[PDB]
Design a binder for these strands. Structure first.
Ligand SMILES: Cc1cn([C@H]2C[C@H](O)[C@@H](COP(=O)(O)OP(=O)(O)C(Cl)(Cl)P(=O)(O)O)O2)c(=O)[nH]c1=O
Ligand SMILES: [Cl-]
Ligand SMILES: [Cl-]
Ligand SMILES: [Mg+2]
Ligand code: NA
Ligand code: NA
Ligand code: NA
Length: 326
DNA sequence: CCGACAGCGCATCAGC
DNA sequence: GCTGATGCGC
DNA sequence: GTCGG
């Protein structure tokens, strides 16, 4: 909020490059610049001052100078006025419509919420459910609701098998006062990097959450990742809660710490951390941290017994979840 | 200058 | 059907 | 769009 004007401008530029230009590197550059400026503990007085931060170069410095002098950016003012860019940007707000489908729909005259509704047969399943809950999926989730959702998910998982461990990650684990969705890390001792003693480990949990009418819709589902929709139950005569996005990730139990580091994020934090790992000669994914040889080929998984072990390998002081909101 | 930019599950489609 | 590329979203 | 080498 200290530099909220600038970071909003950069986020809108990032969205334009991703959604309209399909220029993924410009998208990530703008997001990195917005992240470093959001973290900067001073009210930026000039582009030159912002250029000192890593990820802000000459181009963004000049945009910041325009924004500070005038309160706006002509480039963005023209983008807002362009019907084609505005239409593509809007459609990507539906879950499952990305930049390519958005431009395909616009090209064939499908430009608004009603166009989508009257053309539901042009949508795949994910897009159909994203359209159905368009308004709901724009709402934030109060942390008090996240706590009730956690209670349901952990207890229903416990009812399936007491040896499951479900961990709510995402912004919730970083202590945020509100979240965009619910991310659940799941483990069971039957599923390790060495063996899967039991099938349908994820299915059984999903099935149970559907049975109690917590999970209401499916966006995608495989043996280790479920992405879908859920809803808190409401009380008598009470308006319903919005439907909410939920993601469940089943990770081999012996890879919990890499999985919980990954699912806790933020996404930019993970990108920064994984980039730094590469510079230190390691690669990090949600399963393992491995060394890189002189060929750059990933070696064998290093032993990991805590989140901090992962930080230790890349020579970073440990950062608590609440300081990973980048 | 310029190569690299984090890493991967699931859905869908083309080609065979 | 399988395989590989692409889209999308974490 | 930015940056390390
Ligand atoms: C999108 C994305 C995610 N994650 C990891 C890190 C992410 O933290 C984790 C969950 O993804 P989610 O999109 O739900 O991100 P949240 O942090 O929970 C959030 Cl603040 Cl955007 P909100 O959901 O509360 O609105 O997955 C990544 O590693 N890379 C990615 O590109
Ligand atoms: Cl690009
Ligand atoms: Cl791995
Ligand atoms: Mg989340
Ligand atoms: Na800089
Ligand atoms: Na979308
Ligand atoms: Na998520």
């Amino acid at each position: 909020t200290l530099n909220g004007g600038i970071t909003d401008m950069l986020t809108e530029l990032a969205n334009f490059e991703k959604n309209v230009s399909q220029a993924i590197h410009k998208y990530n550059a703008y997001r990195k610049a917005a992240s470093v400026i959001a973290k900067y503990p001073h009210k930026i007085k000039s582009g030159a001052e912002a250029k000192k931060l890593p990820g802000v170069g000459t181009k963004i410095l000049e945009k910041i100078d325009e924004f500070l002098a005038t309160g706006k950016l002509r480039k963005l003012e023209k983008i807002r006025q362009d019907d084609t860019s505005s239409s593509i940007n809007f459609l990507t707000r539906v879950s499952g419509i990305g930049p390519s489908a958005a431009r395909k729909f616009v090209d064939e005259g499908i430009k608004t919420l009603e166009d989508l509704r009257k053309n539901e047969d042009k949508l795949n399943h994910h897009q159909r459910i994203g359209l159905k809950y368009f308004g709901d999926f724009e709402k934030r989730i109060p942390r008090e609701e996240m706590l009730q959702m956690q209670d349901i998910v952990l207890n229903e998982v416990k009812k399936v098998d007491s040896e499951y461990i479900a961990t709510v990650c995402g912004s919730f684990r970083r202590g945020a006062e509100s979240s965009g969705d619910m991310d659940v890390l799941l483990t069971h001792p039957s599923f390790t990097s060495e063996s899967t003693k039991q099938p349908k480990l994820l299915h059984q949990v999903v099935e149970q959450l559907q049975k109690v009418h917590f999970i209401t819709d499916t966006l995608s589902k495989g043996e280790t990742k479920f992405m879908g929709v859920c809803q808190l139950p409401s009380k008598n005569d009470e308006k319903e809660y919005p439907h909410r996005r939920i993601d469940i990730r089943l990770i081999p139990k012996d890879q919990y710490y890499c999985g919980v580091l990954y699912f806790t994020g933020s996404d930019i934090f993970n990108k920064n951390m994984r980039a730094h790992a590469l510079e230190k000669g390691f690669t990090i994914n949600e399963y393992t941290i491995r060394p890189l040889g002189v060929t750059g080929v990933a070696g064998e998984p290093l032993p990991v017994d805590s989140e901090k072990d992962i930080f230790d390998y890349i020579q970073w002081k440990y950062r608590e979840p609440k300081d990973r909101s980048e």
